[PDB]
Structure 1
Amino acid sequence: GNYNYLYRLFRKSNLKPFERDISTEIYQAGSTPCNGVKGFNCYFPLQSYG
């Protein structure tokens, strides 16, 4: 697997036209203020095609 190519799975709002964004912060799906919690209520957003 070539995991070295990646995509953002989700963001709190859609991009504006040609808005470029490399931010690596945890996406909050639920009530938990994430602070390194991952896989439920909170997710790391940079997925791979592999």
Structure 2
Amino acid sequence: YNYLYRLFRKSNLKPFERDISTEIYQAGSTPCNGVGFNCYFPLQSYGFQ
């Protein structure tokens, strides 16, 4: 689980853009206020086996 990729972003990356941000992603129409369901942490792992 040491390897990671970004699952969500509010806009596409530009060419050779790099982004370390871990701010919560509002997937629904209802605001997240920095904290869950439809309010997702944006980095996930392949869990390689």
Q: Can you list the C-alpha shifts for 1:1-35, whole angstroms capped at 9, x where unaligned?
A: xx000000010011000110000110001133223
Unaligned runs of 5+ in 2: none
State the TM-score, normalizing by the size of structure 1: 0.78
- Cα RMSD of the aligned pairs, angstroms, is 1.5
State the TM-score, normalizing by the size of structure 2: 0.79
CA contact (8 A) 1:32 1:42 kept: no
Q: Aligned pairs, how many?
A: 47
Q: Which runs of 4+ in 1 moved over 4 A?
A: none
Match of 1:41 in 2: 38
Q: Quick one: percent identity of the two aligned structures? A: 100
Per-residue deviation at 1:47? 0.3
